[PDB]
Amino acid sequence: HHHSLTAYQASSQARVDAAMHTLFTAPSPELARLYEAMRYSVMNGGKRVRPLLAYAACEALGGKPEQANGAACAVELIHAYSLVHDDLPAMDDDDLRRGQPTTHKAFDEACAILAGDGLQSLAFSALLDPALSDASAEIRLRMVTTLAQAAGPAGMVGGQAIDLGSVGLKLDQQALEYMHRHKTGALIEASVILGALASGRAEKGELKALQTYAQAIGLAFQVQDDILDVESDTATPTYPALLGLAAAKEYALELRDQALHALRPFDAAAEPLRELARYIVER
Amino acid sequence: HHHSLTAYQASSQARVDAAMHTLFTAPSPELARLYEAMRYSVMNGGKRVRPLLAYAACEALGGKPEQANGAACAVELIHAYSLVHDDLPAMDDDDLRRGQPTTHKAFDEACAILAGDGLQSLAFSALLDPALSDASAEIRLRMVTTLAQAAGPAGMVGGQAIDLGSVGLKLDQQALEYMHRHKTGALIEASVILGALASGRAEKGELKALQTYAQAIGLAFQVQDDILDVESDTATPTYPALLGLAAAKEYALELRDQALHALRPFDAAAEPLRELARYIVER
Ligand code: DMA
Ligand code: DMA
Ligand code: DMA
Ligand code: DMA
Ligand SMILES: [Cl-]
Ligand SMILES: [Cl-]
Ligand SMILES: [Mg+2]
Ligand SMILES: [Mg+2]
Ligand SMILES: [Mg+2]
Ligand SMILES: [Mg+2]
Ligand SMILES: [Mg+2]
Ligand SMILES: [Mg+2]
């Protein structure tokens, strides 16, 4: 039972969905299909957890959540574009995502490539759109810089590349964690740091804490994902294989605890971040 | 005979090549192949004309050319990433570019997808890298915003999408120009506007002139490209087909003239921009 988190997710998804709407109107008829493809790729069925994170970090520091609209859109658009390319035939070659045809299936491969390309750019536009933030010049430099680092070849793209190059190879835990830290950790950290920055009230100490929280939940998610695949398996390169199931479950709990410890400096305004940490390993 | 332009191209290419070197060192062994793929994609044999444009616009306004290093890198990296995805099997399915194997041929498709993805991000990092510019907060907001608009779905990516969706269709001149304006015009304009902005001395009037120049040379290039394909054809949807060869050649001259007219407000510091305009339609 996680009532307030369900309500927080709902408000988070509504706010970022309405914010994004303004981004996806093609400027002309010739551009309509590309914009439709991008829209399709964002209507992917996700829970907008990265926007959730942006908004929650903003409010933890005292900002109005809408101050983080630019951040929330930007991280969701980065996340969207990553999934579209990830599904491509040359990559994971998936026909479905969350029950629906993937973008290259609903459209075609060439459209899907570009839709992903278009979405990465729009993510940066969104971050700087004055309708989406009121942030000050240097804060927004911090934010833009951050997003590019987190999404690029030393971040999420790097993580995808590590994934490809790990096909075959026998990974240990340190290598598995390195790969996850890049593939999904980076953008999760960016989510919380961008949200915090967006409040205008962010101090060095507070960002450190939030980065610690974010690193912890990013790993907890991947550990629990593996645990759930195993448990669903005994229903009808992974953490359980490396550690054994029992030990994997404890690891996930220790990470949830490290995440909650990181949030000790904050007041009740940080409760959604705390409830998410709990949910990730409870789910 | 275009002696000073040859020397300008040479200095332009050396400066941006040295500037980019600092970007392409992988932070770890696991990331080496991705960074190698990106490097490969930038060592594509091009003349760095977009960097040329950035540096020339900067110097036309009185800046030291290195002030535009961030701009020059960013537009070349955007240009690089566009070619890698453009060559992909789902897109143009080219095995060679300028005589060399394309990135998906030297590496594989999945690597090439990501290399293009990584390069788009690095382009934004480069633009904000303090080693590459000294520009002030609001100027650099103008620049970042500009690059995202020019490269994204209302710009170059849009142009690629128009290209795909024009397969088949019978284009008139107005539609052909609309497609070119997006596919290559946008990023050319961005090149000159980013360079100008990078000087710190850019005024509204001067940017207008440079945008006019850039729009004109962007079209002149595409018209002359078509003319050269025809002339090489009688050696051993296009402008010549739409207009006839004779008329296409005149059109290219009228565009060169519109470009040079746009530069009337500037002194001798704008000569490289003038010599490029001449070269494009003389070549
Ligand atoms: C800790 C965290 C961000 C988990 C996100 O899971 P996901 O990537 O499947 O999220 P979404 O449902 O937003 O796609
Ligand atoms: C950054 C990114 C796209 C991660 C998805 O990785 P994956 O292919 O292992 O996960 P999924 O099951 O979502 O395809
Ligand atoms: C007017 C202009 C920018 C022409 C560029 O030609 P190109 O795209 O082939 O340039 P490069 O040789 O730099 O790839
Ligand atoms: C933005 C971009 C990649 C343009 C290249 O278009 P093209 O495929 O018509 O030209 P090329 O002959 O270089 O592939
Ligand atoms: Cl639309
Ligand atoms: Cl390297
Ligand atoms: Mg994958
Ligand atoms: Mg996948
Ligand atoms: Mg897993
Ligand atoms: Mg093409
Ligand atoms: Mg091509
Ligand atoms: Mg042509």
Looking at residue B131, what DSSP letter applies? T
C-alpha–C-alpha distance, residues A263 and B171, integer Å? 60
- Residue among A88, A140, A153 minimizing CB distance to B121: A153
User: Least CA distance to A26: which residue of chain B?
Assistant: B154
C-alpha–C-alpha distance, residues B197 and B83, integer Å? 26
Helix (H) / strand (E) containing A101? strand A100-101
Domain of residue A67: give its range: 1-283
Work out whether strand B96-97 and strand A100-101 pair parallel, antiparallel, or are unpaired: unpaired
Q: What are phi and psi of B100, to 5 degrees?
A: -105, 155
- Residue among B38, B148, B175 minimizing CB distance to A153: B38
C-alpha–C-alpha distance, residues B29 and A100, integer Å? 37
Q: Can you give the resolution of this entry in Å? A: 1.8
Q: Give the pair of three-digit tokens for residue A41.
A: 């790729």
Give the per-residue SS3 of B132-161: CCCCCHHHHHHHHHHHHHHHCCCCHHHHHH
Return contacts of B2-11, CB within 8 angstroms, 24+ apart.
B2/B275, B2/B278, B2/B279, B2/B282, B4/B271, B4/B272, B4/B275, B5/B272, B5/B275, B5/B276, B5/B279, B8/B52, B8/B56, B8/B272, B8/B275, B9/B47, B9/B48, B9/B49, B9/B52, B11/B65
**d(CA B269, ligand 6 centre) in Å:** 38
Per-position DSSP letters for A151-171, written without gaps between them:
HSTTTHHHHHHHHHHTSSS--
The structural domain count of chain B equals 1
CATH of residue B176: 1.10.600.10
Q: Which residues line ligand 3 (CB under 6 A)?
A: B 46-50, 188, 217-218, 221, 280
Elucidation method: X-ray
- Chain B residues with CB-CB distance to A121 below 8 A: 120, 148, 151-153, 155, 157
Which alpha helices (H) appear in chain A, and where do they start and end? 3-21, 32-42, 49-60, 69-86, 103-106, 109-128, 137-151, 156-165, 173-180, 186-198, 204-233, 239-243, 245-262, 271-282
Helix (H) / strand (E) containing B11? helix B3-21
B149 touches A at CB < 8 Å: yes
